[PDB]
């Protein structure tokens with residue numbers, strides 16, 4: 001008999017899903033991935049729940065101050081998000097020391113400003129935890145209680161856990177292919193050569209974006225096999241593919257991103273208020289999604305700010321992964337223009353051009369130059385000059401992306417790592433403490 005507790009409130013919106021409140025316990029009847037079948041102990045109702053809204057009773061996940069599967073760089077992002085404060089903290093899974101835990105605390109340095117600091121939490125036998133050998137605790141819960149009153153060596157005494165908002169509800173179960181009838185397409189957001197993008201609603205309670213495909217050269221079955229495969233390549237930095245309407249014209253359904261494209265966003269008023277570190281943070285999120293593509297041995301083919309989407313919390317996600325592989329020379333590598341050699345390394349070239357888009361708040365690449373003019377300039381070894389608000393070191397990344405030989409271009413794994421810690425010396429990623 002397996003009992004889970006509700007981490008968040010959930011209101012049912014489908015046929016068989018259960019509503020519940022935070023703290024509700026439930027008996028697990030089935031584990032089916034995204035949705036579990038359960039019995040509420042509160043309502044005695046049987047039905048489906050999102051499994052990301054529950055954790056085993058008394059597991060660490062149930063604690064306000066604990067964040068499962070969260071990286072150094074995400075801890076920092078979350079802790080730097082609106083809603084938090086000096087001393088805001090989390091205990092999380094250690095990223096570099098598998099099986100152990102780390103503390104992340106919101107701090108403030110005069111010389112640099114709001115920062116997040118990291119402390120290794122240490123474990124062995126005894127089942128105990130210490131950050132510094134003298135100060136020892138039986139449970140993680142005792143550790144947090146300590147560094148809540150007074151900062152015994154810590155940069156900052158702990159105040160309140162980091163802020164969590166509720167996770168995205170998973171798409172309805174068994175609803176990869178849906179009837180068109182399930183959709184209300186409410187606002188045309190854009191339209192072009194291959195179809196349209198619309199703001200829609202799926203069965204009344206879910207806002208989605210819908211891409212409608214003009215019937216083209218491509219087959220129907222040939223288009224769905226790619227979507228089918230693309231849907232399995234889920235990542236936090238790729239827009240979520242939810243569903244498809246298989247009858248012509250093909251509708252593609254993704255999560256809705258509140259801020260539209262990175263390009264429009266950068267050019268908006270709020271866009272122009274983003275300081276360089278944030279612009280750098282955006283690049284790092286994009287590099288992360290591309291690291292993932294890279295590691296799975298895939299290729300985007302059409303990387304640029306028009307194909308990056310911004311959520312309302314300002315999370316960047318790569319869009320149109322898969323599409324340019326079924327179906328703009330200024331973002332394309334010379335080998336790809338000249339011979340059609342598209343590779344992860346030609347995506348790397350595109351990433352450098354996008355990095356320039358971000359630093360220039362959406363200015364077109366090679367301003368005042370035509371496509372032909374660009375082709376020849378690059379052949380003569382020209383590169384865009386460093387803009388004003390661009391640190392030399394950020395510009396060197398761009399230059400490395402634009403090496404004429406594709407083999408000499410960095411990997412996205414290395415770009416991400418450079419972008420992630422652009423203001424942090426390796427030695428300084430984790431605080432010391434006697």
Ligand SMILES: COc1cc(-c2nn([C@H]3CC[C@H](N4CCN(C)CC4)CC3)c3ncnc(N)c23)ccc1NC(=O)c1cc2ccccc2n1C
Pocket residue numbers: 189190197209210211226227230239241252253254255256257258259260261264309319320321322323326
């Ligand atoms: C639902 O499908 C998609 C939707 C979007 C999308 N575009 N826009 C704006 C962006 C600015 C635009 N415009 C810019 C210019 N300004 C001036 C006006 C506004 C208007 C439209 C959005 N706004 C909010 N949420 C969204 N999800 C989107 C992008 C890609 C896909 N599809 C895929 O990614 C995809 C297709 C696909 C096909 C096959 C396999 C995989 C596949 N995938 C992952």
Ligand SMILES: [Ca+2]
Pocket residue numbers: 426427428429430431432
């Ligand atoms: Ca250190």
